[PDB]
Amino acid sequence: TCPFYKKIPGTGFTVDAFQYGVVEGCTAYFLTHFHSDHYAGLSKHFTFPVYCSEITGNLLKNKLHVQEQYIHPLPLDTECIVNGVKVVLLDANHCPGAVMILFYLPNGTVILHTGDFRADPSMERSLLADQKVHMLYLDTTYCSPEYTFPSQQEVIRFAINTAFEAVTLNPHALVVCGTYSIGKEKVFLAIADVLGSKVGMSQEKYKTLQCLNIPEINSLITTDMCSSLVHLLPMMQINFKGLQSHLKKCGGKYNQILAFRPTGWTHSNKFTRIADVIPQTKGNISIYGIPYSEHSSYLEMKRFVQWLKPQKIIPTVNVGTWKSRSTMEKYFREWKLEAGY
Ligand code: NI
């Protein structure tokens, strides 16, 4: 049974709620972005409207095979009427095609649903700046002060350097990057760009990337592995036994892999900076963990909420235990007292 934090009051609208069957009263099903926890349930047999971004639309049509008519894509940054309710989609700074959604209720209430987001100061000069937001449905993935991590630009720097160093030192080494969903494309695109290569990948991953409206994408990616010196592999596969396995398949063309595992937070963020990172090493294979986050840090979230001064906050992440719920409320109360709203 659909939880109350996936419903929008005063509408027939639900958000990311595709796994409960038909939801009685729901005229419209919004999907914030193409990540399986959010889309769990969709298929070719869905005959209700889905409102989403164009890119999310492309992924629905091509990867899940939903029928063109039941996908309603919308442009971003554009006031749009949807069953006689004004809505806007806003860039969420999460993965490709990920959006936040502003709902303007007839009664005068204004609700922001963040989907998954990495909060940023550029959002403070968006359409959100123009009016009061009464309710906030919030991505609380990292709502605790331990959760610090570097900027994406800091991390891309490290990467571009590690990779380019080694390739110029040993020109028969391979760069690998791990992946399992959309997101974090900048990691491999940046490495390939500095090495003068295309990124090589499976047919299924090539298919996914060709739906993302990345400019000049035909010049950046290929399904020909042999021709390329940056390769993508399943994240499950980014380990010694599996990298060994893969190092065979290339057939005497490379004598060293240098892998990267972009991950979220891990407990070594609490004691080690980004300039001072190391890999695990079992012979000629070296696996880097690098903390490229597409979710708000604690400080980023805090700043965004304190600027927004919402009258009410409804968490969408870590809401399954009373302890987490209670911990989160305490932070929201601190923030509001500091800020005077
Ligand atoms: Ni996500």
Specify the resolution in Å: 1.7
- Best CA proximity match to 254, nearest among 280, 230, 288, 276: 230
CATH 3.40.50.12650 fits 148-295, yes or no: yes
Question: What is the dihedral angle through the alpha carbons of 111, 137, 212, 68, rounded to the nearest 10 degrees?
Answer: -60
- Give the CATH architecture of domain 1-147+296-341: 4-Layer Sandwich (3.60)
CA of 340 to the centre of ligand 1 (A): 31
What type of residue is 319? V
* Other CB atoms within 10 A of residue 268 CB: 11
What's the CA gap between 230 and 193, in Å, rounded? 10
CA–centroid distance, 35 to ligand 1, in Å, is 5
- Distance, CA of 197 to CA of 193 (rounded, Å): 6
Measured in Å, residue 119 CA sits from the centre of ligand 1 at 13
Q: Which of these, 197, 208, 211, 215, lies nearest to 234 by C-alpha position? A: 208
Is the Cβ–Cβ distance between 331 and 143 less than 8 Å?
yes
Expressed in angstroms and rounded, the spacing between residue 33 Cα and the centre of ligand 1 is: 7
Identity of the residue numbered 183: G
**What residues does each domain of the chain span?**
1-147+296-341, 148-295
Distance 180 CA to ligand 1 centre (A): 12
State the SS3 of the chain: CCCHHHECCCCCEEECCCCCCCCCCCCEEECCCCCHHHHCCCCCCCCCCEEEEHHHHHHHHHHHCCCHHHEEEECCCCCEECCCCEEEEEECCCCCCCEEEEEECCCCCEEEECCCCCCCHHHHHCHHHHCCCCEEEECCCCCCCCCCCCCHHHHHHHHHHHHHHHHHHCCCEEEEEEECCCCCHHHHHHHHHHHCCCEECCHHHHHHHCCCCCCCHHHCEECCCCCCCEEEEECCCCCHHHHHHHHHHCCCCCCEEEEEEEECCCHHHCCCCCCCCCCEECCCEEEEEEECCCCCCHHHHHHHHHHHCCCEEEECCCCCCHHHHHHHHHHHHHHHHHHCC
The residues, any chain, with a CB within 8 Å of residue 196's CB and separated by 6 or more, are: none
Experimental method, per PDB record:
X-ray
Rounded Cα distance, 90 and 127, in Å: 8
CA 80 to chain centre: 24
Say how far apart CA 7 and CA 16 lie, in whole Å: 9
Q: How far apart are the first and last CA of the chain?
A: 34
Cα of 182 to ligand 1 centre, how many Å?
9
d(CA 19, ligand 1 centre) in Å: 16
* Cα-to-centroid distance, 161 and ligand 1 (Å): 28
Nearest-angstrom CA–CA distance, 27 and 50 = 10
